Design an enzyme around this catalytic site. Structure first.
Site, PDB file in Angstrom:
ATOM      1  N   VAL A 137     -14.618  85.979 120.275  1.00 32.48           N
ATOM      2  CA  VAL A 137     -13.918  85.036 121.146  1.00 32.48           C
ATOM      3  C   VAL A 137     -13.063  85.860 122.101  1.00 32.48           C
ATOM      4  O   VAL A 137     -12.455  86.854 121.690  1.00 32.48           O
ATOM      5  CB  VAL A 137     -13.041  84.059 120.327  1.00 32.48           C
ATOM      6  N   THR A 146     -37.964  33.695 113.530  1.00 33.42           N
ATOM      7  CA  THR A 146     -38.193  32.360 114.081  1.00 33.42           C
ATOM      8  C   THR A 146     -37.854  32.289 115.571  1.00 33.42           C
ATOM      9  O   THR A 146     -38.750  32.121 116.404  1.00 33.42           O
ATOM     10  CB  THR A 146     -37.442  31.234 113.304  1.00 33.42           C
ATOM     11  N   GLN A 196     -29.177  87.227 117.613  1.00 34.93           N
ATOM     12  CA  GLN A 196     -28.398  87.436 118.820  1.00 34.93           C
ATOM     13  C   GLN A 196     -27.431  88.605 118.639  1.00 34.93           C
ATOM     14  O   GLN A 196     -26.555  88.550 117.780  1.00 34.93           O
ATOM     15  CB  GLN A 196     -27.644  86.159 119.175  1.00 34.93           C
ATOM     16  N   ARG A 197     -27.590  89.653 119.447  1.00 35.63           N
ATOM     17  CA  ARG A 197     -26.793  90.878 119.295  1.00 35.63           C
ATOM     18  C   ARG A 197     -25.320  90.707 119.648  1.00 35.63           C
ATOM     19  O   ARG A 197     -24.448  91.326 119.031  1.00 35.63           O
ATOM     20  CB  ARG A 197     -27.387  92.038 120.105  1.00 35.63           C
ATOM     21  N   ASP A 203     -20.737  85.321 122.281  1.00 38.22           N
ATOM     22  CA  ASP A 203     -19.536  84.677 122.770  1.00 38.22           C
ATOM     23  C   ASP A 203     -19.517  83.225 122.277  1.00 38.22           C
ATOM     24  O   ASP A 203     -20.366  82.421 122.654  1.00 38.22           O
ATOM     25  CB  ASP A 203     -19.488  84.777 124.297  1.00 38.22           C
ATOM     26  N   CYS A 222     -29.926  89.287 125.198  1.00 42.01           N
ATOM     27  CA  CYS A 222     -28.864  88.995 124.257  1.00 42.01           C
ATOM     28  C   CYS A 222     -29.449  88.313 123.019  1.00 42.01           C
ATOM     29  O   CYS A 222     -29.299  88.808 121.898  1.00 42.01           O
ATOM     30  CB  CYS A 222     -27.814  88.116 124.917  1.00 42.01           C
ATOM     31  N   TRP A 247     -27.452  82.827 136.562  1.00 39.24           N
ATOM     32  CA  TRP A 247     -27.965  84.180 136.789  1.00 39.24           C
ATOM     33  C   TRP A 247     -27.513  84.812 138.110  1.00 39.24           C
ATOM     34  O   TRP A 247     -28.037  85.855 138.519  1.00 39.24           O
ATOM     35  CB  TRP A 247     -29.494  84.203 136.674  1.00 39.24           C
ATOM     36  N   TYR A 268     -36.325  88.628 129.507  1.00 35.86           N
ATOM     37  CA  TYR A 268     -36.615  87.479 128.641  1.00 35.86           C
ATOM     38  C   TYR A 268     -38.050  86.938 128.685  1.00 35.86           C
ATOM     39  O   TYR A 268     -38.929  87.415 127.959  1.00 35.86           O
ATOM     40  CB  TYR A 268     -35.615  86.353 128.910  1.00 35.86           C
ATOM     41  N   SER A 279     -19.948  31.253 107.248  1.00 32.01           N
ATOM     42  CA  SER A 279     -18.705  31.344 108.046  1.00 32.01           C
ATOM     43  C   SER A 279     -17.705  32.404 107.553  1.00 32.01           C
ATOM     44  O   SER A 279     -17.846  32.942 106.454  1.00 32.01           O
ATOM     45  CB  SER A 279     -18.009  29.980 108.106  1.00 32.01           C
ATOM     46  N   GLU A 331     -33.400  76.763 132.217  1.00 33.98           N
ATOM     47  CA  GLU A 331     -33.538  78.175 131.849  1.00 33.98           C
ATOM     48  C   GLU A 331     -34.630  78.399 130.802  1.00 33.98           C
ATOM     49  O   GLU A 331     -35.338  79.411 130.852  1.00 33.98           O
ATOM     50  CB  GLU A 331     -32.217  78.773 131.350  1.00 33.98           C
TER      51      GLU A 331
HETATM   52  N1  LIG Z   1     -16.427  39.542 108.395  1.00 32.62           N
HETATM   53  C1  LIG Z   1     -17.268  40.045 109.292  1.00 32.62           C
HETATM   54  O1  LIG Z   1     -16.942  41.215 109.992  1.00 32.62           O
HETATM   55  C2  LIG Z   1     -18.586  39.363 109.556  1.00 32.62           C
HETATM   56  C3  LIG Z   1     -19.371  39.694 110.660  1.00 32.62           C
HETATM   57  C4  LIG Z   1     -20.565  39.006 110.902  1.00 32.62           C
HETATM   58  C5  LIG Z   1     -20.974  37.996 110.037  1.00 32.62           C
HETATM   59  N2  LIG Z   1     -20.197  37.682 108.953  1.00 32.62           N
HETATM   60  C6  LIG Z   1     -20.572  36.638 107.984  1.00 32.62           C
HETATM   61  O2  LIG Z   1     -21.718  37.001 107.222  1.00 32.62           O
HETATM   62  C7  LIG Z   1     -22.399  35.829 106.801  1.00 32.62           C
HETATM   63  C8  LIG Z   1     -23.883  35.909 107.155  1.00 32.62           C
HETATM   64  O3  LIG Z   1     -24.525  36.956 106.448  1.00 32.62           O
HETATM   65  P1  LIG Z   1     -26.127  36.942 106.231  1.00 32.62           P
HETATM   66  O4  LIG Z   1     -26.590  38.299 105.866  1.00 32.62           O
HETATM   67  O5  LIG Z   1     -26.466  35.795 105.355  1.00 32.62           O
HETATM   68  O6  LIG Z   1     -26.639  36.588 107.712  1.00 32.62           O
HETATM   69  P2  LIG Z   1     -27.050  37.488 108.974  1.00 32.62           P
HETATM   70  O7  LIG Z   1     -27.254  38.911 108.636  1.00 32.62           O
HETATM   71  O8  LIG Z   1     -26.097  37.312 110.089  1.00 32.62           O
HETATM   72  O9  LIG Z   1     -28.437  36.813 109.389  1.00 32.62           O
HETATM   73  C9  LIG Z   1     -29.574  36.930 108.567  1.00 32.62           C
HETATM   74  C10 LIG Z   1     -30.718  36.487 109.457  1.00 32.62           C
HETATM   75  O10 LIG Z   1     -30.947  37.426 110.505  1.00 32.62           O
HETATM   76  C11 LIG Z   1     -32.340  37.589 110.712  1.00 32.62           C
HETATM   77  N3  LIG Z   1     -32.843  38.879 110.197  1.00 32.62           N
HETATM   78  C12 LIG Z   1     -32.161  39.779 109.414  1.00 32.62           C
HETATM   79  N4  LIG Z   1     -32.976  40.817 109.128  1.00 32.62           N
HETATM   80  C13 LIG Z   1     -34.171  40.593 109.710  1.00 32.62           C
HETATM   81  C14 LIG Z   1     -35.346  41.332 109.736  1.00 32.62           C
HETATM   82  N5  LIG Z   1     -35.404  42.492 109.094  1.00 32.62           N
HETATM   83  N6  LIG Z   1     -36.440  40.848 110.432  1.00 32.62           N
HETATM   84  C15 LIG Z   1     -36.364  39.635 111.096  1.00 32.62           C
HETATM   85  N7  LIG Z   1     -35.189  38.906 111.067  1.00 32.62           N
HETATM   86  C16 LIG Z   1     -34.109  39.377 110.386  1.00 32.62           C
HETATM   87  C17 LIG Z   1     -32.994  36.485 109.882  1.00 32.62           C
HETATM   88  O11 LIG Z   1     -33.033  35.299 110.647  1.00 32.62           O
HETATM   89  P3  LIG Z   1     -34.323  34.350 110.617  1.00 32.62           P
HETATM   90  O12 LIG Z   1     -34.258  33.483 109.382  1.00 32.62           O
HETATM   91  O13 LIG Z   1     -34.307  33.513 111.874  1.00 32.62           O
HETATM   92  O14 LIG Z   1     -35.567  35.214 110.604  1.00 32.62           O
HETATM   93  C18 LIG Z   1     -32.036  36.334 108.719  1.00 32.62           C
HETATM   94  O15 LIG Z   1     -32.143  35.093 108.065  1.00 32.62           O
HETATM   95  C19 LIG Z   1     -21.705  34.661 107.490  1.00 32.62           C
HETATM   96  O16 LIG Z   1     -20.823  34.082 106.557  1.00 32.62           O
HETATM   97  C20 LIG Z   1     -20.905  35.295 108.611  1.00 32.62           C
HETATM   98  O17 LIG Z   1     -19.735  34.578 108.926  1.00 32.62           O
HETATM   99  C21 LIG Z   1     -19.032  38.353 108.706  1.00 32.62           C
END
Ligand SMILES: NC(=O)c1ccc[n+]([C@@H]2O[C@H](COP(=O)([O-])OP(=O)(O)OC[C@H]3O[C@@H](n4cnc5c(N)ncnc54)[C@H](OP(=O)(O)O)[C@@H]3O)[C@@H](O)[C@H]2O)c1
Ligand SMILES: NC(=O)c1ccc[n+]([C@@H]2O[C@H](COP(=O)([O-])OP(=O)(O)OC[C@H]3O[C@@H](n4cnc5c(N)ncnc54)[C@H](OP(=O)(O)O)[C@@H]3O)[C@@H](O)[C@H]2O)c1
Ligand SMILES: COc1cc(NCc2ccc3[nH+]c(N)nc(N)c3c2C)cc(OC)c1OC
Ligand SMILES: COc1cc(NCc2ccc3[nH+]c(N)nc(N)c3c2C)cc(OC)c1OC
Lengths: 509, 510
Positions: free
Chosen positions: B459, B101, B416-417, B420, B397, B311, B337, B39, B289
């Site tokens: 220019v 998944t 290029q001679r 522009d 050109c 042209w 050309y 979160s 062209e």
């Molecule tokens: N402050 C901000 O601007 C901001 C923005 C966005 C998120 N967040 C925060 O970042 C945290 C989450 O970061 P996180 O890195 O743990 O999670 P995340 O990048 O959002 O999710 C990771 C998940 O994405 C999937 N994934 C990533 N790379 C993959 C790949 N190469 N191939 C297949 N699936 C891939 C996988 O899911 P699967 O397990 O299903 O394969 C992996 O478990 C949270 O706390 C969120 O609130 C912050």
């Protein structure tokens, strides 16, 4: 075949008349930079005297006896001449140039006698002296000019317009110090106003020596030279090719280090010739070959006869056969370079055939355009003729040049597809310098800049070792080109018509 | 058919699926923390608004987002999960979720009861998502792509190959310090290793703002962009000309500031197309062209009927008469050309005459050499023919190009001679970019570098004021060339075959 030639205009001479002669400077100073009391030299250091006599008498060639024909010149202010005992003047083995507004030439000969003409007076400053030394009577009979000074003369040497002709500084530093020094000598530091754009580098410094004068005085010698950024362009590129270049292999199978696409500039202003100083260039050959090109000549024996063998290997029966040119007489190179310059697209048969008014005469066209419409952007010639290519002993390396006019100055850009940094590039730089100088003469314009564009820029793999040694050399100031005589037509110009002055390259290694 | 150049059977060893250009949107604390793993630790509504607005809005006037033209947001699965079910999917945006998944038919579900098809699961990382959004299916609809992250997604976004497609970074800094943050985001500084040869620069920064969450939480926005060194190199030349160039005058008598001799380099690697961003280049014209050049064509009506009128002046009955060409019919430009490229030195009569086998086919030879002996130093084609010159509408050109191979990449040099800087030059940069890309395809090498040699670079006097306004602009990244279909012969390429992706240049200089 006379009305097919380029006629030189009446203003051919003023195009490349040398305004001032290049000079070096020789001085002794203390740690505070002082040079004297205003009439006499304070310190007695015999080892400086020996150095001074040596640097100013000795000539470039080994064991060459100084004589009216070829000698050095020393330029001095009147008061400095007075400081030398009459017994030891004029300084033997050198032309004594004395600056004075009250003493005439003949007047100086009164004083001590009692030879030939080893004394000339100049009514004016160092500029007037360098101006006089620029005349035929002294150029190039006088090999090197030295300003042996006097405060005001050194002062004039270190500012425009003279400072831009200053090639080296030979400075002795005497490690004493006193109030008695009223006149001073200071080299302007890099990037200051007094430096007028010049950046003095140190070429050499001696170890601290002790003077056998009874006073146990310490002293040392330094040679300063003005930083040659133009040649550094080249050296930088060579260093980049060794360090970062790609390994390639040319037609034979020989290894090469290669970089792709580069650009260099060289000023041609005020008779300045970009002949490289870190390794001596075969100028006579450069000169002979360009004239050979300009004439549209394709017989290599004309160069071989004048002792220029650069095309010898490409002109042999052995080579011509290996290019399928089995019907060419030996040394007949086919429609190469010059032929394309003066006779583009003309059908080639043999060298000794007449080709007058056949094909396109690109050089002549350009000469005519420059004289009438200098703003024209189509002013360029080429040797890259796909049709003729198979009939040539060799494809051109330097295959295209474009001219440009600005503020009555003629710039020229050369495009080279394949550039051997070891031999080709230094040769070709000089070649297109000469061309641009000549074409400017032909059109009543001053030389401007030569811009070089490189395609495949390479260094040969076994040349890496030699090249690395050359990289540790600090580039020296460029020499100058002057014309002994002019000629009515362009194609009549001979190598002996022009002279390269103050060329002081490094030794081979 | 017959005298044409047959394309290779395969894609050049090392070539890559086209990747979409994206921006990254992120909120961080001062320690660089983005979350606790599952979160966001802080509550700052003003960032939510900025995030909605940056990812939702389009380029136009008031363009409502629709399935026809919209943005996409790419997120990790955990980020998706963190957004409460009754707010998925994010409105007005394609929602691209990364998961091995969950599938499209898995996430949906997920939600309250009633449904949007604005969702797509991707079994791969950000690379696979950028690949997917480059499909012929998505490039119409999807205008801008945003990486809205997850720590793992941001990480992937910041490293090669992905980092090279990052057009901007929209960072929100929240001035709280929170211990619990276990996931981090650092924008690498210019010159450092993690920067990987990118120079990040601050385009804009807001003043410090205070949030109305009732905690006086301080925050601020900043936009970070990668430096486009190559367009900077062009602009500096333009700026050098204006400041140091000489007053010169063209044939008509119009004023120019000019300099003599300059050289610029552009990277073509992975079909990067150096179309300048600070003033829109007429790409379609460049493309038509060039293929026109390649085919050895000399009939300008072939070009003006495809709505490309460059042209036109040079083809008129009046103009040909003034160049002494009383014989050519209107729009017959002479042996120009393309003719010289494919038939160097051939006698010319008319545009509709058969020229097969005549002259020298410089391109066919160059193609041949590249395939067999690529260390060759004679792989160059010229259009500058002194014999043919007086029979042409205009002398060439861009008149000479040299090829070079290194590391299985085809580089190329253009002479290029007359240059522009306002119109002719950026056009020509694109012409030889395309050419080098095609010749690479034709010889089974991947594209390298374009080196551009300029003769009289100028220019126009009247163009000085507008140039100065353009010079103040910050360059955006260069687009990419994507071949959507292939041809059996090099000559057979139509403009429709290739799509330029992510070319977003500035509007006309006011
Ligand atoms: N402050 C901000 O601007 C901001 C923005 C966005 C998120 N967040 C925060 O970042 C945290 C989450 O970061 P996180 O890195 O743990 O999670 P995340 O990048 O959002 O999710 C990771 C998940 O994405 C999937 N994934 C990533 N790379 C993959 C790949 N190469 N191939 C297949 N699936 C891939 C996988 O899911 P699967 O397990 O299903 O394969 C992996 O478990 C949270 O706390 C969120 O609130 C912050
Ligand atoms: N440390 C060293 O190795 C070194 C080397 C050389 C000299 N010095 C010392 O420097 C001191 C002399 O310096 P200085 O500057 O007073 O004398 P100086 O340079 O030797 O001589 C100046 C004289 O040259 C003539 N002159 C200069 N400019 C002229 C011009 N523009 N037009 C016409 N004539 C011009 C004038 O002679 P007229 O009045 O006759 O017209 C003027 O009086 C001495 O003490 C000497 O020993 C030291
Ligand atoms: C050796 O012959 C002599 C030369 C001079 N000339 C003054 C003098 C002395 C040293 C010098 N040392 C250097 N580096 N450069 C000079 N310009 C220089 C000059 C200009 C004065 C003499 O009388 C004291 C004398 O006879 C001993
Ligand atoms: C878009 O609406 C929501 C988004 C999120 N996602 C987390 C989240 C929060 C702030 C963010 N702020 C910026 N600058 N960029 C982001 N990428 C970002 C994300 C990714 C979580 C929510 O539930 C709290 C929510 O509903 C309000």
């Amino acid at each position: 075949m006379s009305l097919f030639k380029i006629r030189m205009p009446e203003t051919v001479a003023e195009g490349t008349r040398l305004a001032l002669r290049a000079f070096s400077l020789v001085v002794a100073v203390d740690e505070r930079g002082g040079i004297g009391d205003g009439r006499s030299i304070p310190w007695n250091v015999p080892e400086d005297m020996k150095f001074f006599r040596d640097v100013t008498t000795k000539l470039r060639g080994k064991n060459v006896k100084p004589s009216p024909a070829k000698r050095n010149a020393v330029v001095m202010g009147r008061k400095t001449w007075d400081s030398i005992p009459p017994k030891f003047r004029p300084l033997p083995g050198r032309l004594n140039v004395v600056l004075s507004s009250t003493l005439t030439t003949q007047h100086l000969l009164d004083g001590l006698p009692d030879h030939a003409d080893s004394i000339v007076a100049v009514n004016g400053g160092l500029e007037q002296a360098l101006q006089l030394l620029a005349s035929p009577n002294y150029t190039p009979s006088i090999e090197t000019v030295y300003c042996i000074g006097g405060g005001s003369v050194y002062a004039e040497a270190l500012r425009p317009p003279c400072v831009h002709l200053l090639q080296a500084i030979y400075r002795t530093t005497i490690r004493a110090s006193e109030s008695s020094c009223s006149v001073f000598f200071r080299v302007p530091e890099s990037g200051t106003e007094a430096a007028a754009g010049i950046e003095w580098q140190r070429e050499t410094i001696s170890e601290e020596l002790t003077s056998a004068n009874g006073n146990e005085t310490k002293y040392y010698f330094e040679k300063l030279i003005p930083r040659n950024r133009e040649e550094e362009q080249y050296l930088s590129l060579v260093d980049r090719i060794i360090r970062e270049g790609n390994v390639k292999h040319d037609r034979t199978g020989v290894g090469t280090l290669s970089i792709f696409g580069a650009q260099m500039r060289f000023s041609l202003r005020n008779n300045r010739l970009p002949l490289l100083t870190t390794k001596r260039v075969f100028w006579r050959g450069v000169c002979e070959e360009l004239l050979w090109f300009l004439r549209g000549e394709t017989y290599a024996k004309k160069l071989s006869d004048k002792g220029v063998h650069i095309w010898d290997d490409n002109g042999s029966r052995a080579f011509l056969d290996s290019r399928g040119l089995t019907e060419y007489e030996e040394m007949d190179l086919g429609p190469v370079y010059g032929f394309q310059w003066r006779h583009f697209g003309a059908a080639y048969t043999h060298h000794d055939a007449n080709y007058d008014g056949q094909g396109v005469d690109q050089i002549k066209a350009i000469v005519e355009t420059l004289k009438t419409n200098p703003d024209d952007r189509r002013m360029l010639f080429t040797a890259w003729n796909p049709s003729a290519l198979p009939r040539m002993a060799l494809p051109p390396c330097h295959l295209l040049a474009q001219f440009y006019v600005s503020n009555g100055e003629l710039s020229c850009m050369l495009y080279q597809r394949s550039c051997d940094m070891g031999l080709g590039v230094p040769f070709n730089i000089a070649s297109y310098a000469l061309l641009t100088i000549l074409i400017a003469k032909a059109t009543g314009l001053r030389p401007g800049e030569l811009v070089h564009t490189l395609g495949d820029a390479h260094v040969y793999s076994n040349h890496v070792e030699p090249c690395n040694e050359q990289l540790k050399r600090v580039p020296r100031a460029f020499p100058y080109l002057v014309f002994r005589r002019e000629r009515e037509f362009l194609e009549d110009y001979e190598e002996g018509d022009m002279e390269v002055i103050d060329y002081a390259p490094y030794p081979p290694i």
